[PDB]
Design a protein around this ligand. Structure first.
Ligand code: H5L
Length: 460
């Protein structure tokens, strides 16, 4: 139901930029090189005519994106994946090659209030607002050239706007990419001389400080060879998802209720660290493991002692040596994995088991002495020995200003991390309406979603 009105290319300004920019791939980026789709969807109430969209909004967006790209030059380039053995990946922007961001201008007749809503949405409707980027746009002698960012802007006439960004995982983590969206909108909202610095929207691309003192680069690269070839010949087009989106909102008061429920279950136990993050993920992890039971598995209690896994990442910028600036643009994640027994998660203290298992995972990865990289040589080998039916991961973070992306028409009505449907993942972001609250985006088949909503709304 989405019709494409225009496909054009957006580049940095010809003047204040340079014909070339080689950015190195750090050992942090190596584990993400197979993920060519990281998806951020933003919805905006926009009760204005379609002519105002095409004659004013679109031209300004094309102008602000270009202005923004003067500070985010590598996002306008590509990722070069070595085609010959004994060569390493890198990033590059080549103005003489025409490297640019594809911007799609589209229109839809689907119902806008439905698509930005918090109750169920067909996943395929969300994924249908995105532009499908090519896997390889060009092939040099040493490497194959892989695009990094494309954005589709869709207009729901007289009702709203959807901004659908796709980014390669290797160029940015959630923190970095959200800073890029906010910079784009900020410049579009306040013009060219807007002060990105004073808004903390200026990135740093200096990777001379990221040092690989543990040889993880060689270690990760060799381990990624297998994963890369799997994802090498896999369909660039969105699979027909069998899942529905639902969104849940936990106020800071409802977060408090969950902490006090853990402190009353504890009943004299080792001081467990309880944050919004641990509490939110704890709660959602318990509901998720229970809902898998209510959809009744024909393996009786045979499983209950098997381990359930919750996989998340953490930002390491502030833990590195040499110091790493907070605005370092790129990947800088550590892998953390919580685990507990199925029977204990579903039991009468499951919430407490999940929070302590998560707080334990953060402590073994970050609070380790020596450093975050102390145990880094196992970050990849650890996430493999985990079964698909016992795995849950989370994407996004409540720390990032997902609802600060105001292009000048107001803050988003809804921010969806659409790439959540490709796996058993959830997403957690800053709540639009509640100061220290969160939004959980869940991605489940309809019948399983029903079970989940039951428990989630239930005991709480
Ligand atoms: C991992 C976390 C979240 C840990 O959470 P958390 O424990 O809440 O850390 P914190 O918020 O700094 O701590 C605050 C709490 O510390 C608590 N605390 C600290 N120590 C203790 C203690 N010892 N005992 C009890 N409490 C303690 C305090 O009580 C604080 O208050 P509160 O939170 O309860 O209100 C955090 O440290 C971190 O690193 N977060 C970043 C996660 C991250 O980087 N995720 C990125 C994944 S990439 C991703 O998912 C998607 C990328 C992407 C790209 C392009 C696209 O287009 C796209 O769409 C997507």
């Amino acid at each position: 139901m989405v019709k494409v009105l225009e496909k054009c290319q957006v580049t940095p300004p010809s003047d204040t930029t340079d014909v070339e920019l080689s950015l190195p791939v750090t050992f942090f980026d190596i584990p993400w090189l197979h993920l060519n789709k990281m998806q951020s969807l933003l919805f905006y109430d926009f009760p204005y005519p379609r002519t105002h969209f095409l004659d004013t909004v679109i031209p300004n967006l094309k102008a602000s994106l270009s202005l923004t790209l003067k500070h985010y030059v590598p996002l306008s380039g590509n990722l070069l994946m070595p085609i010959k053995s004994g060569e390493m990946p890198k990033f590059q922007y080549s103005r003489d090659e025409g490297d640019s961001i594809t911007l799609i201008v589209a229109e839809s007749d689907q119902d806008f209030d439905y698509l930005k809503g918090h109750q169920l949405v067909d996943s395929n409707d969300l994924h249908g607002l995105f532009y499908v980027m090519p896997r390889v746009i060009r092939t040099m002698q040493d490497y194959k050239v892989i695009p990094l960012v494309a954005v589709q802007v869709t207009v729901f006439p007289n009702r709203g706007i959807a901004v659908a960004l796709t980014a390669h995982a290797s160029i940015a983590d959630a923190k970095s990419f959200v800073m890029f969206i906010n910079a784009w909108a900020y410049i579009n909202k306040f013009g060219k001389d807007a002060d990105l610095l004073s808004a903390n929207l200026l990135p740093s691309f200096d990777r001379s400080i990221i040092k690989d003192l543990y040889g993880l680069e060689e270690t990760f690269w060799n381990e990624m060879q297998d994963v890369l070839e799997m994802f090498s010949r896999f369909g660039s087009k969105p699979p027909r998802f069998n899942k529905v989106r639902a969104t849940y909102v936990l106020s800071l008061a409802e977060i408090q209720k969950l902490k006090n429920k853990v402190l009353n279950l504890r009943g004299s136990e080792p001081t467990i660290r309880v944050t919004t993050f641990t509490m939110t993920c704890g709660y959602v992890w318990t509901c998720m493991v229970k809902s898998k039971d209510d959809v009744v598995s024909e393996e009786s209690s045979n499983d209950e002692n098997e381990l359930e896994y919750f996989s998340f990442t953490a930002d390491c910028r502030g833990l590195l040596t040499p110091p790493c600036p907070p605005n370092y643009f790129g990947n800088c994640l550590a892998s953390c994995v919580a685990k507990a027994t199925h029977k204990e998660l579903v039991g009468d203290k499951g919430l407490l088991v999940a929070v302590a298992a998560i707080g334990e995972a953060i402590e073994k990865r970050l609070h380790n002495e020596k450093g975050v990289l102390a145990d880094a040589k196992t970050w990849l080998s650890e996430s493999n020995g985990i079964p698909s039916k016992r795995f849950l991961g989370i994407t996004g973070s409540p720390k990032f200003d997902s609802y600060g992306v105001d292009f000048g028409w107001g803050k988003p009505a809804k921010f969806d991390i659409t790439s959540v449907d490709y796996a058993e993942l959830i997403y957690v972001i800053q709540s639009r309406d509640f100061e220290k609250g969160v939004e959980i985006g869940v991605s489940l088949p309809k019948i399983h979603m029903d079970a989940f909503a039951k428990i989630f709304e239930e005991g709480f």
